[PDB]
Amino acid sequence: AVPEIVEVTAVNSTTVKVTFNTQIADVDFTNFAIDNGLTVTKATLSRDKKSVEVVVNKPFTRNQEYTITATGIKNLKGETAKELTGKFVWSVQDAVTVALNNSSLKVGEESGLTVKDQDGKDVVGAKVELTSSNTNIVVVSSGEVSVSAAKVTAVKPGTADVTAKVTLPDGVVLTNTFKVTVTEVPVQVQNQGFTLVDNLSNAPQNTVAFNKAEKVTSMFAGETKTVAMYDTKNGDPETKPVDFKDATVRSLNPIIATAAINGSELLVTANAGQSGKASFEVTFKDNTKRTFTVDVKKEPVLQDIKVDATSVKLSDEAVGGGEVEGVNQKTIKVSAVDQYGKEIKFGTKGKVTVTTNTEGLVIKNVNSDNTIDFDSGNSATDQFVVVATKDKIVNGKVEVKYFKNASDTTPTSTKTITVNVVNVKADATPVGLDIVAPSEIDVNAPNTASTADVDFINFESVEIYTLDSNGNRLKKVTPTATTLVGTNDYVEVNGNVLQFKGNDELTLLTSSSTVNVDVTADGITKRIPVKYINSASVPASATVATSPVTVKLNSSDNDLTFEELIFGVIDPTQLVKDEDINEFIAVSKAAKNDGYLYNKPLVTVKDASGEVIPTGANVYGLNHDATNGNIWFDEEQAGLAKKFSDVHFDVDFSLANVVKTGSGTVSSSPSLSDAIQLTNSGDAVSFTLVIKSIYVKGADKDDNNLLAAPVSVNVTVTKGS
């Protein structure tokens, strides 16, 4: 078995690993050489005697082919080979990406992982070990599993890091950490036709707004709240909250809470230190009666603590020394919570201690009696730090104990944090990175209630750590370069920032994909994947009703534009108007024609998830003076921090089979704004619409077309006598 060169990999910009056929004899710099002006500085055989780390005097140029030459290499224990020649490049040519499919979950949801090669295909036989920083919040598959089997499961609302250590079939290990956020699936409150409010001024404008919003039928003991209640009449939503003038109210559980009518307003008062269901009976002038029930809750009171981690993995030291957050120490947050799990100032009644029985762990930022005082009881939060001791490689745990009364000998509860200290060398060679970037950017982030999603990533802001060959952390570093791989129609990199291009992606993006970003830090480049989405409900597809349309104009009227024909003529006689905001909020239930004067609209539009977007007469907040239905959202776009470019459509269409009767007229080639003109009764125009594109107004008729195939529609327009 005679020394041959099997692999040559640029492990960083000044270091190259050369792997051989067999075990070899002890070697130094004199044994190796490198072309293109570089000189070899050092050469160190591993303990596996199977490879040699060779460091070069000066960084490799990206994408330059170099040739290593090995002279005088001895085998196992005998013979010396002739000159060996090995080429290599320093670039991330055949990188493998590791991606968490979905990093914002609701409770109950799950997410898989995706591992792909340079050609974008799944890596067969790839394995992964996941681990969660906080298993109260996120839980993961145990042990080592196939990548396609791996699962991250959402358990409780909040936050967790999930380390993914992936083993490729050829034995390479890639390690990265993901940021996972779990949000609550909000509890469905029994709908009682009211909601509890500070004052009537900040209440929903009408019955439709009320049914759309979150309802509050709870209050704390010691409060009073005003009742905002909403009726419909003949199925039609009312236009203002119910008025309690001349009504009388009876309190059915007056020990718990009481009610009083003061002019138009009904005010419920919850009594101190009471709780449970309290009901009321209202009697109106008209001899109708109704009841309703409010949940009174105990006042909030300190109940328990919460810690922001369940396990921590630390390196025994940091390269360069010191105590470095993320490498050889970890800061842990502790929060004080009430009986409903909300933050509450810590008292001075109780105490919390932080302790370990594990030699080699050090607790800092803690009082000498092991307590943490929560800014002497004024704060709902506090913190401590755990630190590894150099070269003491022990795994143990930290206990965080809450005592109801400071003087109690037994704790009321105990939270446990497991801690694993791994050994790293003070002079370890860095060979990879852990870049803790968020998994996903969403162009709609600024409009989502969640404050956790982002519409960009600044890579100068993300924790990045260098790793040794074992996958353990060495040092905190910052990026030297960031660059997009390939091109993409929706996103780009500018400096160190991944972001949306700005060409109206909010209104126009209806797909989702993943982009790759090469990030260089400390002479190492890593390819990291990022998904982009758009959770806005914007038009993605449209459909045209096919059946012939006949419009009979009133003897009073002459004209119908194409925009009116296609999208409809609004008829306010069929709609409900909120006078307070001068907008329509509904189609009456008695409506003879879905809210439209002539024919019903021809176009039905959907969003990316397949849901119908309300259009025309169904747009909540449609202005009082709207004349046609070419609209898919509120003109003023109430509620949005970031607006759509345009809430209307444009259409590409042609006109065929024109037949005019009497004085009827119409253009040979109209736009949306041109009109069918009929002067006398008996005048008519007949024709066929060929609709070719439908798209958001101002966008592109080809690229943003919502219509899969063109469609033809026969139309007749006559005038009544």
Epitope: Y230, T232, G235
Partner: nanobody, 124 residues
């Protein structure tokens, strides 16, 4: 989609007391506000009383509360109309109705699902 089945109709003498029941079948049928209507002979259909999905709220037609009381058993997903102190003008087909929404609506148009009715007849 929901289905409603009434029970407990029949003959009763003036001054007496009867209970009607209506059981709701479906998938998220638990989530349905329900109500009672009636059509007496010679008269137009009229609203009697209504209840929220979990019985926290009820409402009544003018002058109907007393003579009538609505309640609900959530476990059985059934709703009950209790009639006390009946008189000949309560002779009627009593219908159960259900709705997607709860907003104190006392008209037919506030309700999208109907049972088929039961007859209640009141002697002298």
């Amino acid at each position: 989609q929901v289905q409603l089945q009434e029970s407990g109709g029949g003959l009763v003498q003036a001054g007496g007391s009867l209970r009607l029941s209506c059981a709701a079948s479906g998938r998220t049928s638990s989530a349905y506000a329900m109500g009672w209507f009636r059509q007496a002979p010679g008269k137009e259909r009229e609203f009697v009383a209504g209840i929220s999905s979990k019985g926290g709220s009820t409402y009544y037609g003018a002058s109907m509360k007393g003579r009538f009381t609505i309640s609900r058993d959530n476990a059985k997903n059934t709703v009950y109309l209790q009639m006390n102190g009946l008189a000949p003008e309560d002779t009627a087909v009593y219908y159960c109705a259900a709705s997607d929404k709860y907003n104190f609506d006392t008209s037919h148009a506030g309700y999208g699902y109907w049972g088929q009715g039961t007859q209640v007849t009141v002697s002298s």
